[PDB]
Design a protein around this ligand. Sequence first.
Ligand SMILES: OC[C@H]1O[C@@](CO)(O[C@H]2O[C@H](CO)[C@@H](O)[C@H](O)[C@H]2O)[C@@H](O)[C@@H]1O
Lengths: 552, 406
Amino acid sequence: ISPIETVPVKLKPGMDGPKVKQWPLTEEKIKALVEICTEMEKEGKISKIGPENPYNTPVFAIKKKDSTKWRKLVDFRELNKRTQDFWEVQLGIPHPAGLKQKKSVTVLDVGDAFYSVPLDKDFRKYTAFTIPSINNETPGIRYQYNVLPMGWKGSPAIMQSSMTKILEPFRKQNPDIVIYQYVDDLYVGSDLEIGQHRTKIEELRQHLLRWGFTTPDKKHQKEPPFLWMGYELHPDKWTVQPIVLPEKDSWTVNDIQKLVGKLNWASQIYAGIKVRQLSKLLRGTKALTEVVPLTEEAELELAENREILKEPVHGVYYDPSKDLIAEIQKQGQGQWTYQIYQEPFKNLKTGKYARMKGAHTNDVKQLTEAVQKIATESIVIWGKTPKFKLPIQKETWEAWWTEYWQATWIPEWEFVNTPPLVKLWYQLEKEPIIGAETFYVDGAANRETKLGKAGYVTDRGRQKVVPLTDTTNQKTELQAIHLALQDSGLEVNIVTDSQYALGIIQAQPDKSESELVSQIIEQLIKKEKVYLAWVPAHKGIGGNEQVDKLVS
Amino acid sequence: IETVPVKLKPGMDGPKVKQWPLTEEKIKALVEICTEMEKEGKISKIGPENPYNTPVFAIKKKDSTKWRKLVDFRELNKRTQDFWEVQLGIPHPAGLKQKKSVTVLDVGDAYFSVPLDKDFRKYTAFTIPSINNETPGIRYQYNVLPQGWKGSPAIFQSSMTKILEPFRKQNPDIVIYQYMDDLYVGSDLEIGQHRTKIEELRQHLLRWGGYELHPDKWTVQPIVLPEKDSWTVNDIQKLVGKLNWASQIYAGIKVRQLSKLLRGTKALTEVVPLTEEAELELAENREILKEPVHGVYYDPSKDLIAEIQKQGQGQWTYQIYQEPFKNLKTGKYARMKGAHTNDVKQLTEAVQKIATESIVIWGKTPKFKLPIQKETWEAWWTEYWQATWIPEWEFVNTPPLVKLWY
DNA sequence: TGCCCCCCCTTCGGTGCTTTGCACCGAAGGGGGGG
Ligand SMILES: OC[C@H]1O[C@@](CO)(O[C@H]2O[C@H](CO)[C@@H](O)[C@H](O)[C@H]2O)[C@@H](O)[C@@H]1O
């Protein structure tokens, strides 16, 4: 137990402590919980209480490991709901690509970090639990915590912030010693030669012990490779601890969920990982035990991933005297993969971006989002933004930010010829086309009936009306544009009265969750020239009036 | 000194907003700034048992290379009790918008000499991040009137008027308006002379304990019709739909004469000759468009709204209103950076200029409707912010159905 | 039969529009990883 001052905590206003009865348990668990708590009582982590304390939270018994030694955990779900909110100070996860090369490295853990931090004295009575007796022979043995319980909502933050306050004197005294503190795990690097470095280490251990934090020897790593945060720290490079993917004859939804999660974890260092086709399997499913047959595309993607994973890979460490460089490749179906490096073929890390934001988008927008994801990740890890290498031409980007009405930007980037390139798949003419037919399109739906029509008239005297079933207003308007593109030549002028349809199409999308919009896109890509114009409806205007006419 | 008792508005809790990532140079500056205010007792280290948080970052103004800490108290200010209800409030003076020049002074540090209600401090918590999450976040809360908090100009009102009094009755026709942590001070003297009344005002405040605007050049952009010798069906269609939109704003705008020249199913490129009755409609509409709209008056009890459109070639149109289509001001902001290659920087600068004009004119900033994706804005805007205040904003995706303002 | 954090992918439900469905966005469901 630390002599650090306790952090005052409160229940939420209006609420009392938990009063949850003890779910009965085996005479065996009963006696192991007796064993566990007599040793905690002699260490002062808990103390006996009686019936005058009215609170309770169930104590259940768990096998600690393969050895069969019993482990006690307390189900503070109910007390957690009644305890005040906290502001968590763990803002993120350190990444080994953010580390600089060091001469001397040490990895230490503190032992029973939680059970070494005292708990606010006035709050302890709410952590009361009861060990029951077989068949109610006795009332049972009640205890309460004097230290941070595992399973209480506030324990991780109070242990973390207590550790920060204890490390702070030592950190200020030695600014040339890097201490990464994650919960009870400490990485300590320096450029002092191992003799002076190990002096400072046991000095640090002694500081911790005066404040009640042991550092057991079995957790004191003195030699590379170091096991840290799921990685392996060698002097020149780093490593993920081995990734084992599920292998199944028959896959459940849950199996697939576990597979995608492993592949996303692997994607931080293994370039080119894809999960679009495997995650498609999760869609529309309705039970975690539902067996899902792999599609053909999913088997191929899994095999592609497995080939990548059998090759060994490593990341390098960060050299602050060189630029950060981020290179992106396009993978298809809205998937992007990236590497971040400082010297060529020496990746600090990798990643993937594959989210579809919006019902309708294009590759240029998604490239801009990938840049934004990488820019944020780079500030988290290295505190700065990388120079970019992108498979898009300057002419392409310039054509995009001059004809798109939203402000958009991407920082310093070099073009790199890495097919497939990102490109605009069509561009609407900014002026009407001489010699091209003019289509006046309209579509209307009856909100109550689900029925509608889409149609057009032209300056060449052509006209057409299609009946539509189970449709909407906005669909008939898209439908009307679909007809005009379908029946027109390579150059066309189209006048619509739907601001909605104009809005989607003028954004030059190249993919959509709408099949109707996807159909319009494939026709736009096949035209030579398209001018698309809006007019207000029901003002008896030009051709728009007669096509509206024709709709009814 | 004894504090002023402060409340949140009924049924509202303190801010609970996550800290966003920060560059190396901004974190270093915040740690330098805050450990020094720790030492001066202006803030105090706290822990996670305080459940409130407000983001913080830093800014370098382009001609002061010191860093300035900026806490984003927008959430806290919205939940804070009105001081106007409690009688403490800063009357906006008209006739600041008519001064030759107006300079902006950052005066937020005057607040650091007044303590804050012991029971309100917990709502002012913020957290400094760390690069690569080497440490957990470091949390502080204020013991004094915080910068950027709307309550600090109000609690400090009594005092600043006493600080300013000799200067203002020794200078009756200067006008001084306090907005948040800023002092907007304008008058008609020559810039060389105007500026040293600034620097004299500077020392007077320093011894008890900026940008250079010109309101007269803030011209309005009215909606304009094109002029040509000849007109196509497409030209007339565009014109008709643009005056039809303008009919929700102005009064007695007609499109029936120009409408029926497009009678029939015509080609877009066919040139339609103007009837003289249609030149009649267009000359008439053209100058209803000329002069401002009758019947539009500012209301102090309702919010200000600002809309912005990217027009291209560095240009940006904007409209400030309170009810839809009743514009108090329409304008056009222009780049001058000389770079010409960064849309996000231009929009961030446009927002600061438009909000500055609203402070000068009406005394408060508008809630902006920004023509940009949320995530593109949040990727970059703090790189270009220079104001000690931050306006409300929201993100819109409205394609141009008209090029109404161009 | 417990806690806290970051990530991705899917699903759901609230909001506002001068809408009647649509697009957006944040929260919560699963998974990965850390302690
Ligand atoms: O950009 C919006 C984004 O910013 C946050 C703070 O991180 O909210 C701020 O901006 C809003 C718009 O003005 C305010 O309403 C809010 O009070 C302010 O904190 C996020 O909450 C929001 O997602």
